Ligand SMILES: CC(/C=C/C(=O)NO)=C\[C@@H](C)C(=O)c1ccc(N(C)C)cc1
Ligand SMILES: [K+]
């Protein structure tokens with residue numbers, strides 16, 4: 341009925357403690373609260389993930405290792421080499437607790453979807469799609485997206501994962517690569533030297549999971565209109581061929597114009613239209629956050645997207661709240677595209693969509 345919003349003051353504090361950008365969860369929640377959107381959702385206190393719950397995807401050796409180097413901040417452990425710790429993913433003190441809360445918040449939201457508590461569950465602090473079963477990658481130590489999907493596997497036999505982050509959700513695609521129960525769809529920037537380096541259109545999975553992985557390689561400077569047409573064409577084809585019963589959606593904000601990544605040229609409006617097309621499926625939807633390195637932009641994006649889920653049209657003027665001064669110099673909710681060219685050739689885009697049409701033919705047949 342009413343969208344579940346995963347939040348507790350203790351959870352946000354935990355998320356700000358070891359965040360990449362300081363006060364990541366604070367700003368996003370403070371702005372949502374400022375628009376009084378929390379009063380129209382069902383606020384649910386997240387439960388910290390147990391060792392067994394994480395073990396549904398991650399190996400035991402890896403989990404024990406995190407717990408050991410997290411209590412003292414041992415960034416010099418001789419077993420860290422095996423698990424990808426920790427140059428890109430530092431072995432900072434209390435990192436396992438940080439991952440436990442966020443991992444447990446996605447599972448909690450998934451549990452609300454199972455028990456029929458709602459049709460939509462939101463966790464903006466979640467959605468780290470890079471982590472592997474026994475390896476940390478790209479700031480991700482625990483793949484909370486996979487943990488969420490595995491929780492939904494208790495009720496749903498057809499789960500669709502849609503990744504709209506700037507980067508390819510490799511950790512999630514790799515997790516369900518050998519299965520047809522979960523189809524992963526990832527729209528991302530794909531160029532040599534760009535992280536994580538995988539996710540070409542020819543990457544369709546392995547074994548019995550072949551053709552159940554879908555990748556859309558996109559180039560720099562793409563804007564709302566062209567992006568949506570790509571997203572609509574893929575999701576329409578996938579919905580018919582896969583027939584999902586539940587949806588997990590990762591909405592990273594590193595695609596938005598004004599992000600330090602400086603790749604895609606998106607505004608929250610474009611992603612909003614993508615979210616609308618998925619919401620009208622009337623399926624149990626698990627909304628996750630993701631990447632983003634422009635704090636105020638992330639807040640503007642995810643706050644607007646929360647308004648989309650609720651159907652509310654938000655005021656263009658940023659209301660006075662705790663972090664109001666961070667929204668200079670215009671102090672508005674809208675985000676304007678930068679003056680950069682679109683390097684996506686209309687023929688290559690159509691050529692990719694045709695591959696996907698060809699690959700999904702195998703699924704439906
Ligand atoms: C891991 C990642 C994003 C993942 C993501 O967004 N997953 O969703 C990006 C890495 C490769 C990167 O490009 C980078 C660039 C600059 C930088 N500093 C200037 C500190 C730190 C990292
Ligand atoms: K993506």
Ligand SMILES: [K+]
Pocket residue numbers: 516517518519520522523524545549552553
């Ligand atoms: K798959």
Ligand SMILES: [Zn+2]
Pocket residue numbers: 505506507592594630631632
């Ligand atoms: Zn990203």
